[PDB]
Enzyme design. Structure first.
Site, mmCIF file in Angstrom:
data_model
loop_
_atom_site.group_PDB
_atom_site.id
_atom_site.type_symbol
_atom_site.label_atom_id
_atom_site.label_comp_id
_atom_site.label_asym_id
_atom_site.label_seq_id
_atom_site.Cartn_x
_atom_site.Cartn_y
_atom_site.Cartn_z
ATOM 1 N N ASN A 188 -0.211 48.792 85.749
ATOM 2 C CA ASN A 188 0.784 48.817 84.679
ATOM 3 C C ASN A 188 1.100 47.365 84.237
ATOM 4 O OD1 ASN A 188 2.492 49.868 82.718
ATOM 5 N ND2 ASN A 188 4.163 50.291 84.161
ATOM 6 N N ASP A 196 13.931 40.454 80.907
ATOM 7 C CA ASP A 196 13.629 40.853 82.285
ATOM 8 C C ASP A 196 14.781 40.460 83.212
ATOM 9 O OD1 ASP A 196 11.183 41.659 81.148
ATOM 10 O OD2 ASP A 196 9.993 40.274 82.375
ATOM 11 N N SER A 213 11.477 38.355 72.381
ATOM 12 C CA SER A 213 10.983 37.686 73.604
ATOM 13 C C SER A 213 10.324 36.346 73.268
ATOM 14 C CB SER A 213 10.010 38.608 74.345
ATOM 15 O OG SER A 213 10.714 39.667 74.929
ATOM 16 N N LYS A 240 8.903 49.409 78.627
ATOM 17 C CA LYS A 240 8.413 48.636 79.755
ATOM 18 C C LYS A 240 8.067 49.546 80.932
ATOM 19 C CE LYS A 240 9.637 44.232 77.922
ATOM 20 N NZ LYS A 240 10.585 43.106 77.761
ATOM 21 N N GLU A 241 8.266 49.101 82.164
ATOM 22 C CA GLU A 241 7.777 49.853 83.336
ATOM 23 C C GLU A 241 8.315 51.288 83.347
ATOM 24 O OE1 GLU A 241 8.153 46.641 83.132
ATOM 25 O OE2 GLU A 241 6.974 45.558 84.662
ATOM 26 N N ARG A 273 -1.734 34.285 82.550
ATOM 27 C CA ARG A 273 -2.261 33.448 81.468
ATOM 28 C C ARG A 273 -3.275 32.421 82.015
ATOM 29 N NH1 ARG A 273 2.588 35.033 79.864
ATOM 30 N NH2 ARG A 273 3.326 34.915 77.704
ATOM 31 N N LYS A 295 4.559 35.433 87.524
ATOM 32 C CA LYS A 295 3.602 36.417 87.026
ATOM 33 C C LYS A 295 3.071 36.043 85.627
ATOM 34 C CE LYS A 295 5.091 40.418 85.338
ATOM 35 N NZ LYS A 295 5.836 40.704 84.073
ATOM 36 N N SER A 296 3.978 35.668 84.741
ATOM 37 C CA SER A 296 3.618 35.309 83.387
ATOM 38 C C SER A 296 2.658 34.144 83.315
ATOM 39 C CB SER A 296 4.877 35.018 82.572
ATOM 40 O OG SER A 296 5.654 36.199 82.373
ATOM 41 N N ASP A 344 0.165 42.901 89.601
ATOM 42 C CA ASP A 344 -0.247 42.524 88.249
ATOM 43 C C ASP A 344 -1.347 41.472 88.275
ATOM 44 O OD1 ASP A 344 1.479 44.393 87.143
ATOM 45 O OD2 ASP A 344 2.803 42.907 86.177
ATOM 46 N N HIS A 351 9.612 47.833 89.701
ATOM 47 C CA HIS A 351 10.008 46.758 90.591
ATOM 48 C C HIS A 351 11.417 46.273 90.345
ATOM 49 C CE1 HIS A 351 8.533 43.492 87.557
ATOM 50 N NE2 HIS A 351 8.445 44.662 86.954
ATOM 51 N N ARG A 352 11.803 46.068 89.092
ATOM 52 C CA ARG A 352 13.116 45.495 88.831
ATOM 53 C C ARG A 352 14.256 46.454 89.069
ATOM 54 N NH1 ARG A 352 11.663 40.494 87.797
ATOM 55 N NH2 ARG A 352 9.858 40.363 86.396
ATOM 56 N N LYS A 362 4.831 45.027 92.246
ATOM 57 C CA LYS A 362 4.278 44.677 90.945
ATOM 58 C C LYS A 362 4.326 43.167 90.698
ATOM 59 C CE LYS A 362 3.993 46.376 86.165
ATOM 60 N NZ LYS A 362 4.186 45.183 85.309
ATOM 61 N N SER A 402 6.754 43.870 71.100
ATOM 62 C CA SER A 402 6.364 43.001 72.217
ATOM 63 C C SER A 402 5.836 41.688 71.720
ATOM 64 C CB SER A 402 5.262 43.632 73.055
ATOM 65 O OG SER A 402 4.923 42.803 74.155
HETATM 66 O O1 LIG Z 1 4.119 37.574 78.081
HETATM 67 C C1 LIG Z 1 4.699 37.739 79.200
HETATM 68 O O2 LIG Z 1 4.348 37.104 80.219
HETATM 69 C C2 LIG Z 1 5.813 38.713 79.392
HETATM 70 C C3 LIG Z 1 6.429 39.160 78.264
HETATM 71 C C4 LIG Z 1 7.659 40.065 78.239
HETATM 72 O O3 LIG Z 1 7.269 41.216 77.447
HETATM 73 P P1 LIG Z 1 7.739 41.578 75.947
HETATM 74 O O4 LIG Z 1 7.206 40.460 75.056
HETATM 75 O O5 LIG Z 1 7.053 42.887 75.684
HETATM 76 O O6 LIG Z 1 9.232 41.615 76.017
HETATM 77 C C5 LIG Z 1 8.134 40.374 79.673
HETATM 78 O O7 LIG Z 1 8.855 41.611 79.697
HETATM 79 C C6 LIG Z 1 6.966 40.490 80.640
HETATM 80 O O8 LIG Z 1 7.386 40.889 81.954
HETATM 81 C C7 LIG Z 1 6.212 39.185 80.644
HETATM 82 O O1 LIG Z 2 8.318 42.258 84.513
HETATM 83 C C1 LIG Z 2 9.086 42.920 83.769
HETATM 84 O O2 LIG Z 2 10.311 43.092 83.970
HETATM 85 C C2 LIG Z 2 8.529 43.599 82.563
HETATM 86 N N1 LIG Z 2 7.078 43.685 82.613
HETATM 87 C C3 LIG Z 2 6.354 44.189 81.455
HETATM 88 P P1 LIG Z 2 4.581 43.831 81.624
HETATM 89 O O3 LIG Z 2 4.480 42.464 82.283
HETATM 90 O O4 LIG Z 2 3.935 44.926 82.425
HETATM 91 O O5 LIG Z 2 4.168 43.861 80.192
#
Ligand SMILES: O=C(O)C1=C[C@@H](OP(=O)(O)O)[C@@H](O)[C@H](O)C1
Ligand SMILES: O=C(O)C[NH2+]CP(=O)(O)O
Ligand SMILES: [Cl-]
Ligand SMILES: [Cl-]
Ligand SMILES: [Cl-]
Ligand SMILES: [Cl-]
Ligand SMILES: [Mg+2]
Ligand SMILES: [Mg+2]
Ligand SMILES: [Mg+2]
Length: 426
Positions: free
Chosen positions: A94, A314, A198, A341-342, A27, A22-23, A49, A386-387, A412, A170
């Site tokens: 979300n 996470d 993070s 978070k969620e 991006r 997802k991350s 997402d 989801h988690r 999600k 964050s």
């Molecule tokens: O930048 C990202 O891809 C993410 C950052 C994290 O958030 P935080 O930086 O708010 O912890 C993580 O919880 C999220 O699911 C993905």
């Molecule tokens: O995936 C996760 O556990 C936390 N997500 C936070 P988001 O990606 O919505 O900012």
């Protein structure tokens, strides 16, 4: 309301080809839109997402083609900021990885936007990002509560110069500003005022920005300089890593009830911080084998650990339910932002863990978990998270069932979670 009851699972073994990250996906999609050239993405995640990001890009005028299976996507880059001529409403569910990055990117161009989403998103912070964007000349209005979405943004361009970003709630605020910075009017300097959480997610951002042809000067994660005159250029083909957070459940499942499980799409040199979940499992007593495009977990033993999980917040949730099977009392520390978070995950985790029999101390920014001798069958509430569903699926690795309320909330990030878990369940 829906629910799923999982009967007890006697053995876990097998292999899972991971869904995309997802991350990384969100991006890569945004940078592909801004870049010059067409990006040919593969292993893209199909989840809510990503769908919200794709839908936003559609409204914003980006031309792309998504395959029938939703994992192969060709994005025709705009080679500049967005330029729209009618007011748009962008519903972002979300998805923080859409809301935060788009809040920054939409300031760069020309247009009028409302960024909104589900009720919970309106209760997730964004003020630290807005404050920095405004320093660089942005025009952003809070439509409801100050410091929260929904936002009304008018494109203005972002000015050259130094801004300050609080990194304490964050990392996504810094990620968002970093991604937009090359399209500012000159050199950007970002000074961190409020230490960073993070951190590995910043490494993901910087890595992908470099793949798209942009250099960032990182002065010890306290100051970032984005030299002037750069532009994103598509790398051409782009392979999205498998999701290391999604992998955590299957590695943990092997650690608890294996057998062994091999996950493919991540490995020893992956950019995602959540591969480090495997290092935490290993500390608990699982046997871990690292490959280039796989990781294997094999049952060993499970002993409680007491660790700082700020680097993997996470995947750290998976440790909370794995702890139900460990010898001793587990502590998960330095995870305040679970609360934003969620759902408030510290509160939710404490409630649900107690329902299956654990005794739990819920600290302000930590959780201490003492497992029960006998797990209790409970109907687990999932809080549109989801988690929570994925973590509590592991309870069925005991001699006792678990009932998961609203199991479709896994969509999600991992719509096919339960089918992949079932594949491993012998
Ligand atoms: O930048 C990202 O891809 C993410 C950052 C994290 O958030 P935080 O930086 O708010 O912890 C993580 O919880 C999220 O699911 C993905
Ligand atoms: O995936 C996760 O556990 C936390 N997500 C936070 P988001 O990606 O919505 O900012
Ligand atoms: Cl598979
Ligand atoms: Cl308790
Ligand atoms: Cl408590
Ligand atoms: Cl119950
Ligand atoms: Mg509110
Ligand atoms: Mg200096
Ligand atoms: Mg109650």
């Amino acid at each position: 309301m829906e629910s799923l009851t999982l009967q007890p699972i006697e053995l876990i073994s097998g292999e899972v080809n991971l869904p995309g990250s997802k991350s990384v996906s969100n991006r890569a999609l945004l940078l592909a839109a801004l870049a010059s050239g067409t990006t040919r993405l593969t292993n893209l995640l199909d989840s809510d997402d990503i769908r919200h990001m794709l839908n936003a890009l559609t409204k914003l005028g980006v031309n792309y083609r998504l395959s029938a299976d939703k994992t192969t996507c060709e994005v025709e880059g705009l080679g500049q900021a967005f330029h729209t001529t009618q007011p748009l409403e962008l519903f972002l569910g979300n998805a923080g990885t859409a809301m935060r990055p788009l809040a920054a990117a939409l300031c760069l161009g020309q247009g009028d936007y409302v960024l909104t989403g589900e009720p919970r998103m309106k209760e997730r912070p964004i003020g630290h990002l807005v404050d920095a964007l405004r320093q660089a000349g942005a025009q952003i209005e809070y439509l409801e509560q100050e410091n929260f979405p929904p936002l009304r943004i008018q494109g203005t361009g972002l000015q050259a110069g130094t801004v300050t970003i609080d990194g304490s709630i964050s990392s996504q605020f810094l990620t968002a500003f970093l991604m937009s910075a090359p399209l500012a009017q000159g050199k950007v300097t970002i000074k961190i005022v409020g230490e960073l959480v993070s951190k590995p997610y910043i490494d993901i951002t910087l890595h992908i920005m470099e793949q798209f042809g942009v250099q960032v000067i990182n002065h010890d994660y306290q100051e970032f300089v984005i030299p002037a005159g750069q532009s994103y250029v598509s790398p051409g083909q782009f392979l999205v890593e498998g999701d290391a957070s999604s992998a955590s459940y299957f590695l943990a499942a092997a650690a608890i009830k294996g057998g062994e499980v091999k996950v493919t799409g991540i490995g020893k040199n992956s950019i995602q911080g959540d591969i480090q979940f495997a290092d935490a499992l290993e500390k608990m007593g699982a046997q871990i084998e690292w490959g280039d495009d796989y990781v294997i977990a094999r049952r060993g033993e499970l002993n409680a650990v007491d660790l700082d999980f700020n680097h993997i917040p996470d995947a750290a949730m998976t440790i909370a339910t794995t702890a139900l099977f460990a010898k001793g009392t587990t502590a998960i520390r330095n995870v305040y932002n679970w609360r934003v978070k969620e759902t408030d995950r510290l509160a939710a985790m404490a409630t649900e863990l107690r329902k299956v029999g654990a005794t739990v101390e819920e600290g302000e920014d930590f959780i201490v978990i003492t497992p029960p001798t006998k797990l209790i069958h409970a109907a687990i509430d999932t809080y549109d998270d989801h988690r929570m569903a994925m973590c509590f699926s592991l309870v069925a690795l005991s001699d006792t069932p678990v009932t998961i309320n609203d199991p479709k909330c896994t969509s999600k990030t991992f719509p096919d979670y339960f089918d992949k878990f079932a594949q491993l369940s012998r």
